[PDB]
Amino acid sequence: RQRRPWEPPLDKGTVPWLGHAMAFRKNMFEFLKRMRTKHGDVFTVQLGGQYFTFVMDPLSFGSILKDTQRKLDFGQYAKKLVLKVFGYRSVQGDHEMIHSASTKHLRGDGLKDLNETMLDSLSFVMLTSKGWSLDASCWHEDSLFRFCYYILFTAGYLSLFGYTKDKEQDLLQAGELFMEFRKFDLLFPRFVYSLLWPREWLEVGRLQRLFHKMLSVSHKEGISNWLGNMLQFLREQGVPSAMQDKFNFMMLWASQGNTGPTSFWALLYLLKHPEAIRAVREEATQLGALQHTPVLDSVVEETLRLRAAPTLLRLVHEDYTLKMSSGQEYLFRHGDILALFPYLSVHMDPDIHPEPTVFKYDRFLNPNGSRKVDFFKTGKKIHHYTMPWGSGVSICPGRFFALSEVKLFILLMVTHFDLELVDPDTPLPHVDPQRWGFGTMQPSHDVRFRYRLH
Numbered sequence: 265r266q267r268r269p270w271e272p273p274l275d276k277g278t279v280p281w282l283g284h285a286m287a288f289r290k291n292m293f294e295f296l297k298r299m300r301t302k303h304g305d306v307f308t309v310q311l312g313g314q315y316f317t318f319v320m321d322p323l324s325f326g327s328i329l330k331d332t333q334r335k336l337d338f339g340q341y342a343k344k345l346v347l348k349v350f351g352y353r354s355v356q357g358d359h360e361m362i363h364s365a366s367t368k369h370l371r372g373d374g375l376k377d378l379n380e381t382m383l384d385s386l387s388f389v390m391l392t393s394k395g396w397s398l399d400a401s402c403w404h405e406d407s408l409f410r411f412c413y414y415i416l417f418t419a420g421y422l423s424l425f426g427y428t429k430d431k432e433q434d435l436l437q438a439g440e441l442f443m444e445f446r447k448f449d450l451l452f453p454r455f456v457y458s459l460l461w462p463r464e465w466l467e468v469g470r471l472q473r474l475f476h477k478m479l480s481v482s483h484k485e486g487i488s489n490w491l492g493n494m495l496q497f498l499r500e501q502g503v504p505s506a507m508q509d510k511f512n513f514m515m516l517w518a519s520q521g522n523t524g525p526t527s528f529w530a531l532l533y534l535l536k537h538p539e540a541i542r543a544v545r546e547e548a549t550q551l552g553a554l555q556h557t558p559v560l561d562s563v564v565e566e567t568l569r570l571r572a573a574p575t576l577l578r579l580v581h582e583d584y585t586l587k588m589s590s591g592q593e594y595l596f597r598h599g600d601i602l603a604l605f606p607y608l609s610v611h612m613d614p615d616i617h618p619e620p621t622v623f624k625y626d627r628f629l630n631p632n633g634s635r636k637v638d639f640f641k642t643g644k645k646i647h648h649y650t651m652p653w654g655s656g657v658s659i660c661p662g663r664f665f666a667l668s669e670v671k672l673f674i675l676l677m678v679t680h681f682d683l684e685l686v687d688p689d690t691p692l693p694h695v696d697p698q699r700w701g702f703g704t705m706q707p708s709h710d711v712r713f714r715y716r717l718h
């Protein structure tokens with residue numbers, strides 16, 4: 265490949281036949297931060313098989329995301345990734361069904377009835393798993409991360425994949441899944457980056473087989489319409505049950521992979537900021553009133569802005585031409601992968617968000633407590649001031665549910681428990697760089713905390 269005058273800078277690496285994969289994988293955020301100050305807001309690098317052109321200009325997102333002339337493409341590429349990662353063979357129309365089923369059952373009225381179930385599941389797990397001693401003034405010490413990610417996982421899983429007559433049994437099996445899930449979660453980045461030793465390549469195999477069996481379609485009662493609907497579609501289309509198993513696990517990964525970790529960060533920030541936790545507690549003291557919790561909404565967004573860091577990817581279907589804010593005209597070859605990293609471009613942009621590495625619980629609140637949606641860069645409007653879900657038809661179709669899960673979890677935690685960090689003086693764990701780009705980040709080290717009934 266050779267750069268043409270109208271294309272953006274192409275950096276092949278100092279060891280040209282090794283490229284930038286190694287530095288990219290070690291720390292993607294830092295890597296992109298260094299390439300930006302070297303080449304500017306647009307550049308091309310070869311990673312894995314493909315060529316990636318990173319667009320780091322916040323101002324160009326609106327143009328790219330809304331593909332006026334349909335030059336870009338998400339679906340085709342998405343197809344390629346789930347196959348290689350999960351081994352799922354897409355069928356004609358299954359995507360359409362996912363988002364069709366999501367809106368019908370993960371939003372509006374389907375969501376209301378589902379949230380009911382969540383609350384029941386979320387209360388059951390929290391009451392039953394907290395830990396007890398005959399002394400009710402007895403603090404219990406746990407690691408905050410594993411705690412939030414176990415509660416959110418078990419509850420979300422039972423709310424979506426169903427349960428049986430013996431409630432306690434289900435919580436037990438849900439907890440067993442969680443342990444295995446966490447092992448797979450820990451390996452996932454190095455699995456996708458193909459940076460694993462033989463023992464781990466086999467471990468990932470054992471976990472995938474195990475998850476296929478446990479969620480097997482050849483087996484409860486009362487599962488979410490969301491899942492019930494999809495599986496049914498698959499069944500009608502003639503998808504073998506063995507492939508249905510692989511779908512169920514992919515959906516498990518999507519629905520439970522980020523909710524827990526998000527809850528962890530959101531709660532940890534509240535513990536590290538007395539004024540923020542006061543703000544939500546006072547708001548919390550007044551069945552289905554998620555609609556009137558603006559302070560908690562701001563707190564969740566401010567958590568997502570600080571810890572959600574996915575990568576927006578688009579295959580260039582036919583040659584794309586983008587005019588930059590500055591004024592250049594760049595060309596993108598068909599077959600190139602146009603890529604956005606909203607975390608660096610938008611979340612940490614100090615001009616869009618001043619003091620960006622700081623947790624400001626009221627960041628998305630207006631002086632009059634209203635919802636704030638007016639953000640600018642160099643005086644210029646920004647519609648995507650936070651992109652923790654994606655955009656277009658790649659956007660997380662369960663985002664409204666995920667928000668219900670996280671808000672509900674917080675409320676119950678701050679409301680009925682006394683919370684304290686074991687080493688409040690030690691500063692917060694930073695992001696594990698291994699995961700940059702994979703949804704919600706996970707901490708570099710674990711935080712101990714203690715709790716008890718109020």
Ligand code: HEM
Nearest residue numbers: 518519522523526574652653654655657658659660662666
């Ligand atoms: C904090 C919670 C969550 C976060 C941060 C999150 C984040 C994301 C992100 C970043 C994507 C990809 C966006 C893109 O490709 O542009 C995604 C996709 C997806 N998420 Fe989530 N998600 C969450 C919760 C959930 C839940 C609860 C479900 C289901 C119950 C879910 C189902 C999905 C599905 C099905 C997709 C694929 C969308 C598609 O096929 O086009 N997510 N999520």
Ligand SMILES: C[C@@]12C(=O)CC[C@H]1[C@@H]1CCC3=CC(=O)CC[C@]3(C)[C@H]1C=C2c1cccnc1
Nearest residue numbers: 311312313314345346349456575700701702703
């Ligand atoms: C862009 C990315 C990177 O390099 C670091 C961020 C990586 C994505 C993060 C989220 C993700 C979730 C899945 O469920 C399946 C695989 C992907 C899409 C990851 C695949 C990658 C890639 C690497 C070379 C060629 N193609 C894709």
